[PDB]
Amino acid sequence: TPQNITDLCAEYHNTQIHTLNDKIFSYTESLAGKREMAIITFKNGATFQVEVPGSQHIDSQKKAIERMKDTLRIAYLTEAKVEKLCVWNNKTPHAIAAISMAN
Amino acid sequence: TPQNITDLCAEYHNTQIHTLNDKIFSYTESLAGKREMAIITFKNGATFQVEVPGSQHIDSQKKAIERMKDTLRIAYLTEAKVEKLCVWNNKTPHAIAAISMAN
Amino acid sequence: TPQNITDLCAEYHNTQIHTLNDKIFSYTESLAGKREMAIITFKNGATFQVEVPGSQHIDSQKKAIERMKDTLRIAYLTEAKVEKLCVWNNKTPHAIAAISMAN
Amino acid sequence: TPQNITDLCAEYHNTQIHTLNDKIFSYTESLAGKREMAIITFKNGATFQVEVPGSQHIDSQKKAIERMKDTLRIAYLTEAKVEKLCVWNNKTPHAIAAISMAN
Amino acid sequence: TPQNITDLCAEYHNTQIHTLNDKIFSYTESLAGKREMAIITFKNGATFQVEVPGSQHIDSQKKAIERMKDTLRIAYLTEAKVEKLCVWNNKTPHAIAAISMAN
Ligand SMILES: CC(=O)N[C@H]1[C@H]([C@H](O)[C@H](O)CO)O[C@](C(=O)O)(n2cc(CCC(=O)NCC[C@@H]3O[C@H](CO)[C@H](O)[C@H](O)[C@H]3O)nn2)C[C@@H]1O
Ligand SMILES: CC(=O)N[C@H]1[C@H]([C@H](O)[C@H](O)CO)O[C@](C(=O)O)(n2cc(CCC(=O)NCC[C@@H]3O[C@H](CO)[C@H](O)[C@H](O)[C@H]3O)nn2)C[C@@H]1O
Ligand SMILES: CC(=O)N[C@H]1[C@H]([C@H](O)[C@H](O)CO)O[C@](C(=O)O)(n2cc(CCC(=O)NCC[C@@H]3O[C@H](CO)[C@H](O)[C@H](O)[C@H]3O)nn2)C[C@@H]1O
Ligand SMILES: CC(=O)N[C@H]1[C@H]([C@H](O)[C@H](O)CO)O[C@](C(=O)O)(n2cc(CCC(=O)NCC[C@@H]3O[C@H](CO)[C@H](O)[C@H](O)[C@H]3O)nn2)C[C@@H]1O
Ligand SMILES: CC(=O)N[C@H]1[C@H]([C@H](O)[C@H](O)CO)O[C@](C(=O)O)(n2cc(CCC(=O)NCC[C@@H]3O[C@H](CO)[C@H](O)[C@H](O)[C@H]3O)nn2)C[C@@H]1O
Ligand SMILES: [Ca+2]
Ligand SMILES: [Ca+2]
Ligand SMILES: [Ca+2]
Secondary structure: OOOOHHHHHOOOOOEEEEEEEEOOOEEEEEOOOOOOEEEEEOOOOOEEEEOOOOOOOOOOHHHHHHHHHHHHHHHHHHOOOEEEEEEEOOOOOEEEEEEEEEO | OOOOHHHHHOOOOOEEEEEEEEEOOEEEEEOOOOOOEEEEEOOOOOEEEEOOOOOOOOHHHHHHHHHHHHHHHHHHHHOOEEEEEEEEOOOOOEEEEEEEEEO | OOOOHHHHHOOOOOEEEEEEEEEOOEEEEEOOOOOOEEEEEOOOOOEEEEOOOOOOOOHHHHHHHHHHHHHHHHHHHHOOEEEEEEEEOOOOOEEEEEEEEEO | OOOOHHHHHOOOOOEEEEEEEEOOOEEEEEOOOOOOEEEEEOOOOOEEEEOOOOOOOOHHHHHHHHHHHHHHHHHHHOOOOEEEEEEEOOOOOEEEEEEEEEO | OOOOHHHHHOOOOOEEEEEEEEOOOEEEEEOOOOOOEEEEEOOOOOEEEEOOOOOOOOOOHHHHHHHHHHHHHHHHHOOOOEEEEEEEOOOOOEEEEEEEEEO
16 A cells, blocks of 8 residues: 555556646536546646546545545635546546645 | 536537536535425525436436535535526426535 | 525415524533434524424435534534524424524 | 433433543553454543453444444544543443543 | 543454654555555654555445545644554554544
């Protein structure tokens, strides 16, 4: 088990770390069918998604996908600094795998 | 997958974008049977619903419909500026498909 | 579909609207068996419940009854003005069907 | 159905009201097996638990037990004044049945 | 039943109490498959995990694992002082069993 997001990120293929050190600029959420997902942006336009649950996900990720969306919404509303995101870069928007926040 | 609420909204029939750039003026919620829903309004009078779950919804939307009502409650209480809504315009009130929030 | 709490409330037998325009004075909730409920009061004396779930309720209302208790707790803690309540008046305390909040 | 926490407390055996009129001093929660529970204390030393769900509880209490842990956490973090607790006094620490909160 | 975290912690094999008396320095959470977890650090460099749900865990712990992650996230965002952690020391990072918070 990893001790930090950078290390956890590197346990997967098709990942990269984005270092933001900034609050979220915009939070978007959708309940439209086949687009049950969230999208966030930062002030420079970099855009990220929490993917729609799909075949690529294993069952244990389902709860976690819901929690991440909970996280992003509260982070946005509290203007919390996001340190890093670990993302899969084989999707557009890059798909969030993990988030770190630090003051 | 879309990168933003406008493009997402364009993936569906019977939808349009409202551009509000304003906080929620009122939040209403009901537990009355066949009316388990939320309704919001803006100061310009525009009124939107989170629809009662119905036969038009697919199963993957049920959790996202609960999430949206969570989101609208917290956005209301935090006076968060709603940027745009993507809504179905074949329902009265217009039915929320997606929301975007930015400063 | 109604557009506001007053019209929604009138879709049911045994309901009325109370107009508070005040924050919640006290919040009470219970885990005791057969009294899994919430009770709120206002400074004017008015007291309301969220009913214990029972067979008077259809299944779709179960989640909304939970949500309503969430809403009342957070509105209490945030000192949010409650505008109106739709209640059933064939219970004592009057049973909450819907709430509206506005500045 | 009762109108207040004292009357509700009186519908059960082995209970009493404690009047705190104070915020919670400490919040403790555990995920260890067989000790899935919450413990709070007040500055006067008084200590209370939300019991581990057990065979004494009826199905309808399960969700209310989770909700009470939620309520205690948020009451702690927001330094909400706890007015009264209804507890069962045949457990040690005394076990929370109900809570009231007021300015 | 125990009345505080130290005594609770002592009812299990392979645990220890860490005393932090400090806010959380960073919160990380992951939805990557097999790494559905949270990791927190403090400014003293100490690092702790909420374990991925696993076969070691009994059924009653699953809800409490989710609750813990909720607790850590909101502790972080409110800059709540963490008093103590009870951890299992047979995992790297040490795995959270229980948390106490006090001003
Ligand atoms: C910590 C750990 O177990 N890491 C392993 C992961 C992991 O088991 C799977 O990602 C969990 O589903 O599986 C890795 C990986 O890099 O993802 N893996 C996966 C596979 C074949 C199946 C596969 O690619 N699953 C990942 C799909 C990806 O799912 C992602 C979401 O979880 C994203 O949607 C991404 O865009 C998609 O490519 N072969 N190796 C190997 C890596 O060592
Ligand atoms: C991104 C994507 O998958 N978009 C597609 C959507 C989508 O698959 C469905 O809406 C998901 O249920 O289905 C589309 C759509 O526009 O909704 N679709 C669906 C259909 C036939 C069935 C249909 O109209 N289902 C949606 C009914 C609408 O449900 C909405 C709620 O989700 C609202 O209640 C709206 O008022 C109602 O008309 N014809 N086209 C085509 C579009 O390309
Ligand atoms: C918008 C809508 O569908 N409104 C209709 C409602 C509604 O279908 C049911 O209340 C939902 O269960 O059912 C109405 C109603 O007024 O409640 N209805 C239902 C009935 C027969 C059964 C009945 O009275 N169910 C409601 C019981 C009430 O449940 C309420 C909780 O939901 C309260 O506990 C109230 O104290 C209790 O009397 N007769 N009229 C007719 C109304 O037009
Ligand atoms: C409003 C209401 O229905 N009140 C009744 C309650 C109630 O039905 C049960 O407590 C719900 O499970 O059941 C009462 C009660 O006082 O608890 N009751 C129940 C019984 C036999 C079974 C019994 O004692 N159940 C309660 C056990 C208590 O559970 C509590 C958790 O809910 C605590 O853990 C407590 O320490 C324990 O003694 N005898 N009286 C009588 C009371 O009038
Ligand atoms: C209050 C109480 O019931 N305490 C008892 C606990 C408890 O029943 C179990 O931990 C609940 O799963 O079980 C104890 C314990 O110390 O864990 N126990 C359990 C066992 C054999 C099975 C066992 O080791 N289960 C715990 C494994 C641990 O699970 C933990 C998560 O819950 C951690 O992942 C930890 O790293 C791992 O070693 N031997 N003693 C004895 C202790 O008296
Ligand atoms: Ca700070
Ligand atoms: Ca204001
Ligand atoms: Ca205000």
